[PDB]
């Protein structure tokens, strides 16, 4: 992609792809959002808003040519700059296996946190209603192993009456899961009992929510809409360092909320 003016950064082949791979590794396990919603293939660097498919009436019956606006859903562009030490990446070429690019590791994670935030609670400013804002899809849950199983099956039953069925997934706070794993200490693995009561579903632990969440990955209920996917580009050179960045273009919508169940 030509605009990330990467060709102009003072970096070798090895260097560029060493930076890329590091960020790819982190994004893969830290974009908790994408682990269970679906992504809508990159629409292009210039895609500006995703159509919502409604009109905004703006006329009296006093006017003959009645009319309105088409509701769209503008995409966020984000740009997280960071600096890397040149005379250090140079070291990659000298042989050095691990080069010090913690400057990048953090920036990546912060971008990751950003996106999840939008998937999970949304920017009111951008018009996207987050996952957790769907109050009508909240049910109460205990704190025993047994209380969780109960929740699951009651959930599977709310789905059953909406027709909603995919493979089912448990999104769950990392620490909360450590806690359920306390009382279920070697009688029989909680992992498998949850996966069973989910009918062959999977379980995603995450530090992006504080409670729990249940969805069906049957697909097409949680669109993350990509314009230009997460890329790395070059901004400038600060004497003895390089300023790269991390751009993305996106938005999000919960289409069929009935594929969603929130917890306590």
């Amino acid at each position: 992609m030509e605009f990330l003016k990467r060709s102009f950064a003072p970096l070798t082949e090895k260097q560029w792809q060493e930076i890329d791979n590091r960020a790819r590794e982190i994004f893969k396990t830290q974009l908790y959002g994408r682990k269970f919603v679906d992504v809508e293939g990159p629409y292009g660097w210039e895609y500006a808003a995703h159509p919502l498919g409604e009109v905004e009436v703006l006329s009296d019956e006093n006017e003959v040519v009645k009319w309105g606006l088409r509701k769209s859903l503008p995409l966020i562009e984000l740009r997280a700059t960071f600096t890397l030490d040149l005379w250090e990446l140079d070291n990659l070429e000298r042989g050095k296996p691990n080069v010090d690019l913690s400057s990048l590791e953090e920036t990546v994670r912060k971008v990751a946190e950003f996106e999840d935030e939008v998937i999970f609670r949304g920017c009111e400013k951008s018009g996207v209603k987050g996952l957790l804002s769907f109050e009508e899809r909240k049910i109460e849950c205990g704190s025993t192993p047994k209380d969780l199983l109960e929740a699951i099956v009651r959930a599977l039953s709310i789905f059953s009456k909406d027709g909603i069925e995919g493979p089912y997934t448990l999104v769950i706070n990392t620490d909360r899961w450590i806690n359920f794993l306390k009382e279920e200490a070697g009688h029989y693995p909680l992992e498998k009992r949850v996966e069973e009561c989910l009918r062959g579903g999977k379980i995603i632990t995450t530090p992006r929510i504080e409670d729990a969440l249940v969805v069906s990955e049957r697909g097409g209920d949680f669109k993350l809409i990509l314009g230009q996917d997460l890329s790395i580009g070059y901004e400038d050179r600060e004497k003895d360092a390089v300023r790269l960045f991390i751009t993305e273009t996106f938005t999000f919508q919960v289409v069929n909320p009935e594929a969603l169940i929130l917890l306590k």
Binding site: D20, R24, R34, G41, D229, S231, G233
Partner: peptide, 8 residues
Amino acid sequence: GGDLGIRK
């Protein structure tokens, strides 16, 4: 070129 290419 560029990009990064993640999407699950």
